[PDB]
Amino acid sequence: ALDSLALDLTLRCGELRLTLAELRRLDAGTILEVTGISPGHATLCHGEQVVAEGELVDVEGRLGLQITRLV
């Protein structure tokens, strides 16, 4: 009777800090380096809490997340 509770989850595929002044100054075409993550890796999140780890995969041209570890 709560098993049916629907959770909005997001894929967190990197983390970084910028100052507000830095963020205001970003232009299209510039690349931000996002250290701390293996490229294509994503964490499955509810808000700030991690629920699962995964890899971004191609599914017939669509984006999929293949779960590698439940957390």
In the complex, minimum distance from the CB of residue 43 to its own copies, in angstroms, rounded to a whole number: 9
- Please say whether the beta carbons of 56 and 42 come within 8 A: yes
In the complex, minimum distance from the CB of residue 69 to its own copies, in angstroms, rounded to a whole number: 6
Q: Which residue has the tokens 């999929």?
A: 64
In the complex, minimum distance from the CB of residue 41 to its own copies, in angstroms, rounded to a whole number: 8
In the complex, which residues of this chain contact its own copies (CB under 8 A)? 2-35, 37-40, 42, 44, 51-52, 54, 56-70
Name the CA dihedral angle for 46, 3, 64, 56, rounded to a multiple of 10 degrees: 40
